JSON list of C-alpha atoms in Angstrom, two decimals:
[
{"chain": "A", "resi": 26, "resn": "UNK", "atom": "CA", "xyz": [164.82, 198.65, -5.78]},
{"chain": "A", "resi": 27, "resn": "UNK", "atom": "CA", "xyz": [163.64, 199.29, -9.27]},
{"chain": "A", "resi": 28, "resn": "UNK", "atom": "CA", "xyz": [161.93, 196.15, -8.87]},
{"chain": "A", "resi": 29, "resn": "UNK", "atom": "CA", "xyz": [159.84, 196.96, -6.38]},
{"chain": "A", "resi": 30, "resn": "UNK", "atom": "CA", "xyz": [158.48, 200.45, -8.15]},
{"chain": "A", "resi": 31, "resn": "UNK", "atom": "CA", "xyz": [156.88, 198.17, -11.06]},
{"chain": "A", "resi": 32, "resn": "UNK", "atom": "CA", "xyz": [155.72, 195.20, -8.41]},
{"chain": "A", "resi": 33, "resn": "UNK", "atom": "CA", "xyz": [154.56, 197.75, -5.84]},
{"chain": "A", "resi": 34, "resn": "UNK", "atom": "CA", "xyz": [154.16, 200.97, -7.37]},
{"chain": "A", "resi": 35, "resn": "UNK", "atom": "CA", "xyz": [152.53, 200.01, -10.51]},
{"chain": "A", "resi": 36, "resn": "UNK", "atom": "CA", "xyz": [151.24, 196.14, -10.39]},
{"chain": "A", "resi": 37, "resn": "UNK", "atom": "CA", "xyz": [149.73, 196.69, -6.61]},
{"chain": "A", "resi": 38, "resn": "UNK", "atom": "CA", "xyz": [147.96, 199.95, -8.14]},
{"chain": "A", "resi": 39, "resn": "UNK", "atom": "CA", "xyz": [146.65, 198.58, -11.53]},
{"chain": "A", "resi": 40, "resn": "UNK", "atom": "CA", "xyz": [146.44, 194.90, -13.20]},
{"chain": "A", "resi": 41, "resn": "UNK", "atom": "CA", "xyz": [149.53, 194.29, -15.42]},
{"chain": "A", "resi": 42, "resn": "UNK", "atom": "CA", "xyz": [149.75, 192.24, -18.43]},
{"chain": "A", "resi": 43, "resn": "UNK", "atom": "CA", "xyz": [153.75, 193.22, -18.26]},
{"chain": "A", "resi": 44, "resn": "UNK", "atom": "CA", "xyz": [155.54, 196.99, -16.55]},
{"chain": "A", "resi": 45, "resn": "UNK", "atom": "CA", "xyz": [158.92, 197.99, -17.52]},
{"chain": "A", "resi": 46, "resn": "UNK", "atom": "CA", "xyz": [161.52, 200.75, -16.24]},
{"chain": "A", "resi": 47, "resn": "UNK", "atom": "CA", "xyz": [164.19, 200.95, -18.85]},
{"chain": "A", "resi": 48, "resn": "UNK", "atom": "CA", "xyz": [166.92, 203.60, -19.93]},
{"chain": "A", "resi": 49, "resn": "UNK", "atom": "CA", "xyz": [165.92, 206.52, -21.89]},
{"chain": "A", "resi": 50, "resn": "UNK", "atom": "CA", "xyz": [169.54, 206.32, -23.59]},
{"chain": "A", "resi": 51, "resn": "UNK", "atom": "CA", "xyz": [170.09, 202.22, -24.41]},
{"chain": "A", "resi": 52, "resn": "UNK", "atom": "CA", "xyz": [166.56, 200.73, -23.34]},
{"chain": "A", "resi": 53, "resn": "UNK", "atom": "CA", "xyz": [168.42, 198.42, -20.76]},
{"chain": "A", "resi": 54, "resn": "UNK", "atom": "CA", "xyz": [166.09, 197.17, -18.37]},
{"chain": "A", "resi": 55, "resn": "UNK", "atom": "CA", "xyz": [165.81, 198.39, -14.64]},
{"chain": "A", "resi": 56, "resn": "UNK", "atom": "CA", "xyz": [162.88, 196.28, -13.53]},
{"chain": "A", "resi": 57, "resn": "UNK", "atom": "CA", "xyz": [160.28, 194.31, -15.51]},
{"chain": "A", "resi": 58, "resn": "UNK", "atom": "CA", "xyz": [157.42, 192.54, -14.60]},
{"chain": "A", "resi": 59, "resn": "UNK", "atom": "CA", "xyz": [155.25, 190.13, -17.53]},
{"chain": "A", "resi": 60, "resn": "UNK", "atom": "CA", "xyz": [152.32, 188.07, -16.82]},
{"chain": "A", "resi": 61, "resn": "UNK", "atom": "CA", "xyz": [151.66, 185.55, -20.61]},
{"chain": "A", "resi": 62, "resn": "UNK", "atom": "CA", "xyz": [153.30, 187.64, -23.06]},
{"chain": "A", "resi": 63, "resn": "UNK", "atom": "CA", "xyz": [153.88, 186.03, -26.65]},
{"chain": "A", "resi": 64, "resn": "UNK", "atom": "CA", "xyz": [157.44, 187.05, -26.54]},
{"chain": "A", "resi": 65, "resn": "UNK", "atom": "CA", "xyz": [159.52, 188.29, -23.14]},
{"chain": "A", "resi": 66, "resn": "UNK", "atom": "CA", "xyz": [159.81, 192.17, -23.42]},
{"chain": "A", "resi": 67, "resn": "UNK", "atom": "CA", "xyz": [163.38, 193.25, -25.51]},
{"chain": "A", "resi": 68, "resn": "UNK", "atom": "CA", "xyz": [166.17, 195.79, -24.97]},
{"chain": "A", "resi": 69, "resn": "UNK", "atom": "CA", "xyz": [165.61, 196.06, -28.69]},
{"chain": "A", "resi": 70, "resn": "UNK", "atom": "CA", "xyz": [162.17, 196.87, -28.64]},
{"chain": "A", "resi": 71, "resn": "UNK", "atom": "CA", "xyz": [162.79, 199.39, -25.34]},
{"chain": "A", "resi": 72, "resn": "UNK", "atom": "CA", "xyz": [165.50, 201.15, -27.61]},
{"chain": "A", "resi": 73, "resn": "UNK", "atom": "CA", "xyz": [162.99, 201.37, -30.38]},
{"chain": "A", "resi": 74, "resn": "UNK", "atom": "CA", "xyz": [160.71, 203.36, -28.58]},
{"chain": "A", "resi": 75, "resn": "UNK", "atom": "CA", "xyz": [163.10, 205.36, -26.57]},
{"chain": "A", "resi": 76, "resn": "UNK", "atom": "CA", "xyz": [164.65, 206.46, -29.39]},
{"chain": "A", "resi": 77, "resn": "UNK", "atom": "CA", "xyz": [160.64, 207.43, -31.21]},
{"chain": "A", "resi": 78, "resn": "UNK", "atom": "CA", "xyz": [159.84, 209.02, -27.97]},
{"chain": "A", "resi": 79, "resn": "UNK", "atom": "CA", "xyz": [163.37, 211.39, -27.66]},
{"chain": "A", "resi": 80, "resn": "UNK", "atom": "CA", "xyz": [163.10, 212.43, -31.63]},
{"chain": "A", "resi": 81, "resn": "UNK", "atom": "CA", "xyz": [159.71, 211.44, -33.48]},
{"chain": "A", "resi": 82, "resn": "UNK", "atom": "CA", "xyz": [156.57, 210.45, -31.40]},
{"chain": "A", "resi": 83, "resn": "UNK", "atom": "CA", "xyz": [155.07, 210.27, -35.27]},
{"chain": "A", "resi": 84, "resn": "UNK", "atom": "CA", "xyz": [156.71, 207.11, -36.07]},
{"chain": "A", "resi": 85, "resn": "UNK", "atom": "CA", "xyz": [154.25, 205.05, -33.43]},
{"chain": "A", "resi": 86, "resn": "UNK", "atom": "CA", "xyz": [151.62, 206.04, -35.75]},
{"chain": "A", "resi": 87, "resn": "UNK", "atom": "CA", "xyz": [152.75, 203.80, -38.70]},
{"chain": "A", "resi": 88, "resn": "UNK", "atom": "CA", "xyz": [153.51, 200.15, -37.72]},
{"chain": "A", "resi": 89, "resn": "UNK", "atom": "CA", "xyz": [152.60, 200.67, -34.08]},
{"chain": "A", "resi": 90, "resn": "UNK", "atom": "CA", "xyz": [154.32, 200.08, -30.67]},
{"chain": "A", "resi": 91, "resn": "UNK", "atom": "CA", "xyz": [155.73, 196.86, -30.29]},
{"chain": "A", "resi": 92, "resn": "UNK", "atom": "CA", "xyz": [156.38, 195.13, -26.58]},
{"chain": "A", "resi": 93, "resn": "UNK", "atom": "CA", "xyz": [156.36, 191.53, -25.51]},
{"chain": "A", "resi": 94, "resn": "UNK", "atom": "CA", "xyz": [155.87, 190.74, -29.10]},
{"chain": "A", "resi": 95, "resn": "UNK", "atom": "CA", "xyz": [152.66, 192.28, -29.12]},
{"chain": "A", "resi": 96, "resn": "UNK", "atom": "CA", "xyz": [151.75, 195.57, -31.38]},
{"chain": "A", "resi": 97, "resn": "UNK", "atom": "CA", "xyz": [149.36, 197.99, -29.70]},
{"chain": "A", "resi": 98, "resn": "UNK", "atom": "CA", "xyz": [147.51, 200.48, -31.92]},
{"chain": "A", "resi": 99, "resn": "UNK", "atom": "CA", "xyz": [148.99, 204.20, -30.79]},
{"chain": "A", "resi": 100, "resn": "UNK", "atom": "CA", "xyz": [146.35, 206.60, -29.65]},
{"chain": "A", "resi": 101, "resn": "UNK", "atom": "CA", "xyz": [148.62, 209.46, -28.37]},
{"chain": "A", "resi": 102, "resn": "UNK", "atom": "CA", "xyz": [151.95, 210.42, -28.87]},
{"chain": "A", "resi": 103, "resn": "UNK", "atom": "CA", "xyz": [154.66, 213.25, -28.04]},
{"chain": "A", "resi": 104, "resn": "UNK", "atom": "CA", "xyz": [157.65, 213.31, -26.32]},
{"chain": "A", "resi": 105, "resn": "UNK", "atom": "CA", "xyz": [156.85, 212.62, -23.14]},
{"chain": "A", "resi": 106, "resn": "UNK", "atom": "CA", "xyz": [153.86, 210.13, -22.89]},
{"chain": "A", "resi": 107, "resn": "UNK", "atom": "CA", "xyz": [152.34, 208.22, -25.62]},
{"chain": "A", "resi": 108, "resn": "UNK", "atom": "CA", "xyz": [149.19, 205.73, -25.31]},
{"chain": "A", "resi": 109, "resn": "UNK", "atom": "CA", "xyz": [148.19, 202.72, -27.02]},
{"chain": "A", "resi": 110, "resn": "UNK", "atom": "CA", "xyz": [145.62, 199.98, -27.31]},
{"chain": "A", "resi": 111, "resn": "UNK", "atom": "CA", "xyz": [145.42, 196.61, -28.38]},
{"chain": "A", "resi": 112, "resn": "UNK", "atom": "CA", "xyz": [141.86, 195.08, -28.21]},
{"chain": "A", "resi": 113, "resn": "UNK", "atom": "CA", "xyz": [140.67, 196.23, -25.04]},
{"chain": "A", "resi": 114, "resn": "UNK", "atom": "CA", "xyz": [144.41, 195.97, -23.32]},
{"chain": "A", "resi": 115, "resn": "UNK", "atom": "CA", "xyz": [145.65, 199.65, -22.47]},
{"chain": "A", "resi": 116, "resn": "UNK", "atom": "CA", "xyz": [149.10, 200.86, -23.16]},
{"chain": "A", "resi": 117, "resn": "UNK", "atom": "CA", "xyz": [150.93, 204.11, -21.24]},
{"chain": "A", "resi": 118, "resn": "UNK", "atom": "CA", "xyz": [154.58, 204.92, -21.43]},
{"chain": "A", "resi": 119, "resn": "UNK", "atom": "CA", "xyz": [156.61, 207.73, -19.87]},
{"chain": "A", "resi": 120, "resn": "UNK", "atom": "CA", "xyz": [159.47, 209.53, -20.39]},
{"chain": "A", "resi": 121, "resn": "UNK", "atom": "CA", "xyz": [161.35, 210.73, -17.43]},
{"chain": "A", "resi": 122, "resn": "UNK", "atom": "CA", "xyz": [164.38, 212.74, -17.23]},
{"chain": "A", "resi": 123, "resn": "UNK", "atom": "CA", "xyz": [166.53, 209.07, -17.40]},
{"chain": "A", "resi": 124, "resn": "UNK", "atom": "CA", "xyz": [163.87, 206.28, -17.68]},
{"chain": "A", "resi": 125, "resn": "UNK", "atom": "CA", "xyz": [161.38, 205.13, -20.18]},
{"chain": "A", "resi": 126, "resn": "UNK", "atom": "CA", "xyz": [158.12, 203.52, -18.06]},
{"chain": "A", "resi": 127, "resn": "UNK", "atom": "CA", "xyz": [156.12, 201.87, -19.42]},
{"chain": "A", "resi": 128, "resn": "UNK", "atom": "CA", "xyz": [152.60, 199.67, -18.35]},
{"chain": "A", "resi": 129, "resn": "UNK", "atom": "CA", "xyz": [149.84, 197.72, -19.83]},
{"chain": "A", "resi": 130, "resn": "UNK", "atom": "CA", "xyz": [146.90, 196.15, -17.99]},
{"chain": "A", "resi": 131, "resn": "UNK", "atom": "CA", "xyz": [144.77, 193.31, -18.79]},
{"chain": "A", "resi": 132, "resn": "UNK", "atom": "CA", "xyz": [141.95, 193.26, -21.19]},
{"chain": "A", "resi": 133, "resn": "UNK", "atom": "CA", "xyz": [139.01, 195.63, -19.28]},
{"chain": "A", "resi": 134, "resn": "UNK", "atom": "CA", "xyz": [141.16, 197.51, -17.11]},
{"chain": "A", "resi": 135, "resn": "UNK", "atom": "CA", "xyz": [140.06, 201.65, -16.91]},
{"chain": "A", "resi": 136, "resn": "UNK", "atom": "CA", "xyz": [142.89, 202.86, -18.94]},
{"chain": "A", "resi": 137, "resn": "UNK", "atom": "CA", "xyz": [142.36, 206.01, -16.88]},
{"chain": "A", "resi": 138, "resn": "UNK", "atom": "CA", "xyz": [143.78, 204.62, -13.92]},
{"chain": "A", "resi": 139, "resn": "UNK", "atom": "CA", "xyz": [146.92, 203.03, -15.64]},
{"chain": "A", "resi": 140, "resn": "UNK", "atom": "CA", "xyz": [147.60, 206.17, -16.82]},
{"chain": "A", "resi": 141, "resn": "UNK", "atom": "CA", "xyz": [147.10, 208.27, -13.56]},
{"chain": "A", "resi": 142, "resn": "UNK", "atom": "CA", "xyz": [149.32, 205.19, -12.37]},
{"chain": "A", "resi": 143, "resn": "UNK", "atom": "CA", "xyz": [152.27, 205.60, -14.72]},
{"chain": "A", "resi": 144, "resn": "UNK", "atom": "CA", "xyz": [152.02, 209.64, -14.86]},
{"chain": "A", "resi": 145, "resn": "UNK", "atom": "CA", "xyz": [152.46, 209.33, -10.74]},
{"chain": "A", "resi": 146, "resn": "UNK", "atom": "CA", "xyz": [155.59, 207.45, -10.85]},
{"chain": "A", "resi": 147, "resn": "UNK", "atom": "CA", "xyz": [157.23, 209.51, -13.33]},
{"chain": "A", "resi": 148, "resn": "UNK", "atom": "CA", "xyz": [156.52, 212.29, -11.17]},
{"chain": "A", "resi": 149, "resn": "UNK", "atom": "CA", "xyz": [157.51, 211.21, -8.45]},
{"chain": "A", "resi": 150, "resn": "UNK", "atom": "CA", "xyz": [161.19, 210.08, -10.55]},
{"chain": "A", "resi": 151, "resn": "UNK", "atom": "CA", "xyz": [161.23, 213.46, -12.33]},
{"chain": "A", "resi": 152, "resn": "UNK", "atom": "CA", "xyz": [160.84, 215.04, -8.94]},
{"chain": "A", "resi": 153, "resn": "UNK", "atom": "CA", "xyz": [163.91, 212.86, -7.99]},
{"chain": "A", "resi": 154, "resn": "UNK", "atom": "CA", "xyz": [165.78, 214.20, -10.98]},
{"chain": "A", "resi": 155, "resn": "UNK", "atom": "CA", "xyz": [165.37, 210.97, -12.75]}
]
């Protein structure tokens, strides 16, 4: 199940504050997990960076990328993976050929591994033609 990519795939691999698969198209949700988010994580907000991802990574750079009612600080962007931080809480998203992923870990975790995390399963969907 979709589910079990972000419990499994992502949240056995890394420590999530929240993981999401969403559509690339209408940033429905597949699968999320959260752990204490302000806010639960939005189609809205999904859509919003879907749609920056697909036709301006730029925008992340003013106002930031907002999930779970939190806004993370962007520190990479184009149109197929863009980064973020907020305090020491790391921020990776993917594009796929049909899904947005997207993962951030607790304060401390190696961002290197969340993103080696996230890259792999978008690989591994890409590779699947999704």
């Amino acid at each position: 199940s979709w589910q079990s990519y972000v419990d499994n795939q992502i949240c056995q691999h890394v420590d999530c504050r929240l993981a999401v698969i969403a559509g690339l198209q209408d940033g429905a949700v597949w699968a999320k997990f959260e752990k204490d988010l302000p806010k639960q994580i939005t189609q809205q907000e999904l859509k919003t960076i879907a749609d920056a991802i697909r036709s301006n990574p730029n925008s992340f750079l003013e106002g930031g990328i907002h999930l779970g009612g939190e806004k993370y600080i962007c520190i990479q962007a184009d149109n197929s993976l863009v980064r973020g931080r907020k305090g020491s809480s790391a921020l990776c998203i993917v594009a796929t050929n049909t899904c947005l992923l997207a993962a951030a870990t607790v304060d401390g975790f190696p961002p290197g591994q969340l993103n080696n995390v996230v890259e792999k399963l978008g690989d591994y969907l890409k590779a699947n033609n999704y």
